[PDB]
């Protein structure tokens, strides 16, 4: 598809709307909300190639991705383009990492037990995604590199930010990894009314007015799902990212499973042109 290659090679973005009214808050620390089909979970698009690459040996994943893992430099460029030197920032990404631990092939007859990759992992989304709001004061921008677009928590989190700031953009940069479902939120033009209501709620729970890293855990914050319309506008973005990832990961899997049984094959070659 030409939209896949356009997105990988130029980037893509969505503008999200401003919601005067903050949803009912109910921060809870420990466990994140579950992915669900109501929140746009699509296991064939978002997950199935990830399960294939999980099941490979990490030594082999390392080899077949050596030449296409670049240093992720998307936040540095975002700073530059927005002539920042201001802005509060958080990075929940796994910069220059793809897998969490060395692991052998999972045998054919064994079904996958946990996600070893930093891809489509809703558990990466820890409560420090709201760390920038504590040391917020008078900054024009709140920039967050998200680690995933998978699951319910990342959508509920963008819904909160969309009441806190009047201009919220979700994007994925050319100089991010297109092996991973990371993205950047750029918010600007804060709305004190709700920043204050949010922080009051959060502080009555953590019972501290400054950040403690012990609170960098998984979390849930909303109860009632969000307006279907909002999920759908998010998916306008995440669908395009997962569609690009799906092709990327399909080339990789085809290469790693080629009859050639070598790293020089038609799929590996096409994957290099795509990403570099």
In angstroms, how far apart are the furthest CA atoms of the chain?
Answer: 61
Technique behind this structure? X-ray
Tokens of 216: 């960098």
Supply the DSSP symbol for 15: E
Q: How many helices (H) and strands (E) does the chain have?
A: 10, 7
Q: Are 178 and 248 in contact (CB under 8 A)?
A: yes
Closest CA to 55 of 128, 123, 108, 129: 108
Domain residue spans of the chain:
2-275
Distance of CA 147 to the CA centre of its chain: 3
Cβ-proximal residues to 17 (8 Å cutoff; 6+ apart), any chain: 162, 168, 230, 233
Closest CA to 144 of 174, 85, 187: 187
Question: What's the CATH number for 2-275?
Answer: 3.40.50.11680
Cβ-proximal residues to 159 (8 Å cutoff; 6+ apart), any chain: 19, 23, 222, 226, 230
H or E element that contains 59: helix 58-65
Residues paired with 87 in a beta bridge? 141
Gap between the Cα atoms of 223 and 181, Å rounded: 25
Q: How many CB atoms lie within 10 A of CB 96?
A: 10
Cβ-proximal residues to 83 (8 Å cutoff; 6+ apart), any chain: none
Paired sense of beta strands 141-146 and 87-91, if any: parallel
Residues paired with 168 in a beta bridge? 16, 187
Tokens of 59: 């030594």
Rg (CA), the chain: 19
Q: Which resolution, in Å, applies to this structure?
A: 2.2
Q: Which residue has the tokens 């990832």?
A: 245
Decide: residue 24, CB within 10 A, 0-12 exposed, 13-18 middle, 19+ buried.
exposed
Gap between the Cα atoms of 174 and 188, Å rounded: 22
Gap between the Cα atoms of 163 and 216, Å rounded: 22
Gap between the Cα atoms of 44 and 236, Å rounded: 17
Tokens of 67: 């030449």
H or E element that contains 80: helix 74-81
């Amino acid at each position: 598809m030409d939209e896949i290659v356009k997105n990988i090679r130029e980037g893509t973005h969505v503008l999200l709307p401003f919601y005067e009214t903050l949803p009912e808050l109910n921060l809870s620390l420990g466990k994140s909300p579950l992915p669900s089909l109501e929140y746009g979970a699509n296991y064939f698009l978002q997950i199935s190639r990830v399960n294939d690459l999980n099941r490979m040996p990490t030594d082999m994943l390392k080899l077949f991705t050596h030449d296409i893992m670049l240093p992720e430099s998307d936040l540095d460029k975002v700073y530059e383009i927005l002539k920042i030197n201001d802005a509060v920032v958080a990075d929940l990404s796994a910069r220059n990492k793809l897998f969490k631990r060395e692991r052998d092939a999972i045998k054919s007859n064994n079904h996958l037990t946990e996600n070893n990759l930093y891809i489509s992992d809703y558990k990466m989304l820890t409560f420090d995604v709201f760390r920038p709001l504590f040391d917020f004061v008078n900054e024009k921008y709140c920039i967050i590199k998200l680690p995933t677009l998978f699951g319910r928590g990342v959508i509920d989190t963008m819904r909160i930010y969309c009441s806190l700031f009047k201009n919220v953009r979700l994007l994925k940069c050319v100089s991010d990894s297109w092996l991973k479902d990371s993205a950047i939120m750029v918010a600007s033009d804060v709305y004190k009314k709700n920043l204050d209501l949010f922080m009051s709620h959060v502080k009555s729970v953590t019972k501290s007015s400054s950040w403690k890293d012990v609170n960098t855990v998984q979390f849930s914050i909303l109860n009632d799902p969000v307006d279907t319309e909002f999920i759908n506008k998010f998916l306008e973005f995440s669908n395009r990212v997962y569609e690009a990832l799906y092709y990327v990961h399909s080339l990789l899997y085809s290469s790693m499973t080629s009859d050639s049984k070598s790293i020089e094959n038609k799929h590996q070659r096409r994957l290099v042109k795509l990403l570099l």
